[PDB]
C-alpha cells in the first residue's frame, strides 16, 4: 500500500489523497455515510481515501491499485444500504470518493445533459427545475442519493410508471475500466453499456458520467394525500389498491405507506403524483379507485419540481434550494424488499399492520410502490433490472432508528430482528424461485462471498438471480469480458464465468 501511495504521486494532486495521519480524514470518510450504523469504530476503515478532481486521477487510482494489489471501493453520495461503498470486509482497501466530480451540464433544447457521478439526485433535480418547468428526470425521491450508485442499480421514483427507471433513460456514459481506459458508450460497447445501467456499477468499473435523456412534463401536475387511521377501513382500501394501482393510466402514481403518524398510531398514507390537471385526476380516481374517497381538498396542483420537494417532505412553498443540501442523515436503518406478483390476502395486510404497532417499529415503514405502466411495458431483457411485467408492485420493509443508539449493537438488534421477521412472514405471498430483490436495496442477508462454493460463480449465483433473475448470466458474460481480472469486486459483486 506504501508503494501504492507513492505511485499516485508520480499529475494526481497531493491534497486529494487522504490517509489516517491527515487531520482531514475521518471527516472526509464520515461526511457521506448515509447509514450511520456503519460509521462506528468497530467497522472496517480504509487505509486511504482519494477525492479525484479530474478523470485522469481516477485512472491513476485504478492503474496504481492493480499494480500494487490494492483493493478499492467507489463512493458517490454513500446511500449504500450495507455501506459497501466505504466498507470492505476482511481485506484492506481504499476509497474513491467522487464528491468533487458532480458537474451537471444540461442541453434543455435537445433534452439531454451530462451528469458527473458525484452529483446527487437533488442537485440534478435542482439544475433541471430551476431552468425549465416542462422537463424532468425519472429518479428517486430522496435528494441526497447519488446518481452514481442509484443509476447504476436502476432507480425508481414517482415517474416510473410513465418513464421507467433512471437507468431506462440514459443514452451514453463515461466509464473507467480495469485498464484505466476512459470509455464512452461508443468505445465501451453495447454489452458494457447495458451492464452499467442496472447491474450494480461496483462490478464493472468507475462510472465517471451519465448522459441523461430529459422527459416531458406539463408545467402543471397534481399531487394528493389521503390519510386513513382506521385499520378496518384502511385494510379495505389497501385490498382494492392491490388490484387497481398497476393498471391505472401511466400518468397516475399511487403509493401506499404503512407507518406511524404524529399521534403515534399506525395509519395508511396514500400519496400520489398525477401527470395532469386536478379535475382529470379526480374524474379518473372516482372511476378506478372510488374507495380512496379522494376529493379536491386532498389535492394540490404544482410544478413537477415542486412535487419533488413535496415527496421529499419539505414544508409547502419551501425554496427549491433545499434540493442542493448534502447533509448527513441522523437515522440508521435496515431495509429489505420484495416483489408482489398477485394480491396478498386481507389476512396478510392485517398482520403487517399489526407488526408496525411494535415499539421498535416506531420509526419503521412498509412502503408499497406500484409498477405496471412503462414497468410492465418494458421487457425483462432490456436492462439488467429484471422486475417488469408480472410484478404488480414492489414492497420495502425498512426500520429507522436514531444513530445515538448504535453505541450498543445489542440494543439495535431489535430493529434487525423486526425487519427480518416481517420479511419471513411475507414469504408465501411474494415472488419465489427466485425471490426477487432490488439491487439498490443491498442486503447481505440474501448472501455474500465467504467460501460456501468452490468458485465465485456458483456462490454468487445465489443472490445474483434474486437481484437480476434471467439477466444474471448475461451480466456474468459482460463481467468476464470487461473485467477478466475481477478487479472491481465487493461482497455481492457479479462473478466471473466458469
Ligand atoms: C439512503 C437511501 C437510499 C434509497 C432510498 C432512501 C434512502 C434514505 N430510497 C430509494 C428509493 O425510494 N428508490 C430507489 O431507487 N433507491 C432508493 N434508495 C437506494 C439508493 O438508490 C441506493 O442506495 C443507491 O445505490 C445509492 O447510491 P449512492 O451513490 O448515493 O450510494 P453509494 O454508497 O455511494 O453507492 C452505492 C453502490 O454503487 C457503487 N457506486 C457509486 N458510484 C459509482 C460509480 N460512479 N461507478 C461505479 N460504482 C459506483 C458503490 O460502489 C456501491 O456499491
Ligand atoms: Cl431514492
Residue numbers in the entry: 28 to 37, 43 to 530
Show me the paper's own sentences about this structure.
Among these, the flavin-dependent oxidoreductases berberine bridge enzyme-like enzymes stand out, because of the bi-covalent attachment of the cofactor to the protein via a histidine and a cysteine.
Crystallization was conducted using the sitting-drop method, yielding crystals diffracting to a resolution of 1.8 Å. Asp369 and Glu426 are found at a distance of 2.4 Å, indicating that they share a proton. An additional interesting feature of the active site is the proton-relay established between the putative catalytic base, Tyr188, and the neighboring acidic side chains of Glu426 and Asp369, which presumably activate Tyr188 to facilitate proton abstraction. The distance between the chloride and the C(4a) of the isoalloxazine ring is 3.1 Å. AtBBE-like 28 features a hydrogen bond donor to N(5) (Nπ of His174) and a catalytic base to initiate substrate oxidation (Tyr188) and hence shares the hallmarks of a flavoprotein oxidase, as proposed by Fraaije and coworkers.
